[PDB]
Amino acid sequence: QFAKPEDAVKYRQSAATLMASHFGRMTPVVKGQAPYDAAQIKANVEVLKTLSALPWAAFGPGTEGGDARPEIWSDAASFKQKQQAFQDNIVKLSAAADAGDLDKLRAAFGDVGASCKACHDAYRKK
Amino acid sequence: QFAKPEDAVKYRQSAATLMASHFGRMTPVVKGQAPYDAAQIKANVEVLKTLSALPWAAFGPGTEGGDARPEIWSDAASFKQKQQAFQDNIVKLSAAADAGDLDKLRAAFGDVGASCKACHDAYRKK
Ligand code: HEC
Numbered sequence: 527q528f529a530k531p532e533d534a535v536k537y538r539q540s541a542a543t544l545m546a547s548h549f550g551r552m553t554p555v556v557k558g559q560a561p562y563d564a565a566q567i568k569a570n571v572e573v574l575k576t577l578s579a580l581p582w583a584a585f586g587p588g589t590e591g592g593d594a595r596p597e598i599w600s601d602a603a604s605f606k607q608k609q610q611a612f613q614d615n616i617v618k619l620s621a622a623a624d625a626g627d628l629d630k631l632r633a634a635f636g637d638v639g640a641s642c643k644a645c646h647d648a649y650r651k652k
Numbered sequence: 653q654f655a656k657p658e659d660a661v662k663y664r665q666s667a668a669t670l671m672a673s674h675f676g677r678m679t680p681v682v683k684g685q686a687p688y689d690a691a692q693i694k695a696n697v698e699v700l701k702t703l704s705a706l707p708w709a710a711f712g713p714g715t716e717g718g719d720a721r722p723e724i725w726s727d728a729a730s731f732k733q734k735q736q737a738f739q740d741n742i743v744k745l746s747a748a749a750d751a752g753d754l755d756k757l758r759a760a761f762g763d764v765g766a767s768c769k770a771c772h773d774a775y776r777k778k
């Protein structure tokens with residue numbers, strides 16, 4: 527869907543911006559500093575689920591650039607494993623949210639965050 | 653969810669970027685220049701539906717900036733009418749996509765595009 531590689535870069539950076547907001551805005555909830563409203567979090571995690579599927583299609587062939595490492599493309603199966611595992615962790619977060627289980631939400635949230643960081647450590651330029 | 657107004661601006665601009673991609677990537681389909689796969693479009697319009705609900709919450713109080721006109725806030729009911737009407741047009745696009753009705757999709761697509769433009773004309777700085 528991208529006329530030029532720059533358009534893919536802009537897309538995936540914007541998807542990442544939205545994911546960071548929808549994930550990070552729950553930090554105060556998981557820490558107990560903001561109240562836990564199960565319906566609110568369920569809805570927010572549904573948005574995050576949709577968003578968290580979006581970046582990967584924007585690392586398509588020829589879309590090199592931004593702060594994306596070339597090993598994303600040269601090690602395609604490994605990068606895929608990381609994004610699929612991240613979305614697996616998102617599924618677990620969804621299950622926790624859908625159940626209205628705060629303890630499960632905290633745990634799942636931590637696992638998601640670790641998966642974001644693990645990918646950035648390997649595949650995002652400093 | 654925004655620590656500073658700049659964070660709201662960044663969010664809504666990123667949501668707009670993603671909406672522009674998910675809407676605009678259908679242009680070749682509506683024009684017949686790319687093939688129509690009903691399932692593909694149904695899925696894409698579901699993503700667009702999710703995205704198209706997102707910008708409005710990021711024009712919250714104190715989030716003035718970017719290319720957002722101040723009349724967004726001083727005429728709150730009027731701006732609301734425009735975003736609600738836009739999402740109404742998105743619902744019509746969803747119905748067309750879900751039905752697998754290409755003629756209905758073309759028509760709905762045009763109405764959505766007109767709604768984007770009508771808001772920008774009134775509420776987005778040149
Ligand atoms: C690999 C499988 C990733 C996972 C999982 C997550 N992110 Fe990511 N992120 C990744 C890359 C390769 C890049 C660079 C993209 C580019 O072309 O520049 C990013 C970037 C970000 C950014 C910065 C966006 C920008 O402003 O330019 C943010 C804020 C970000 N990523 C956040 C984020 C979060 C919150 C994640 C988990 C919920 C997450 N990312 C996962 C690769 C990967």
Ligand code: HEC
Nearest residue numbers: 665668671672675717718719720734735738768771775776
């Ligand atoms: C008002 C109800 C709007 C509707 C409907 C749509 N858009 Fe919009 N858009 C609006 C404003 C007020 C702004 C400026 C935001 C800011 O603070 O700068 C925008 C911006 C955009 C942009 C530019 C984003 C950027 O790169 O900075 C794009 C690409 C955009 N809008 C696209 C877009 C599309 C495709 C829409 C319909 C599907 C649409 N917008 C509707 C206000 C409104």
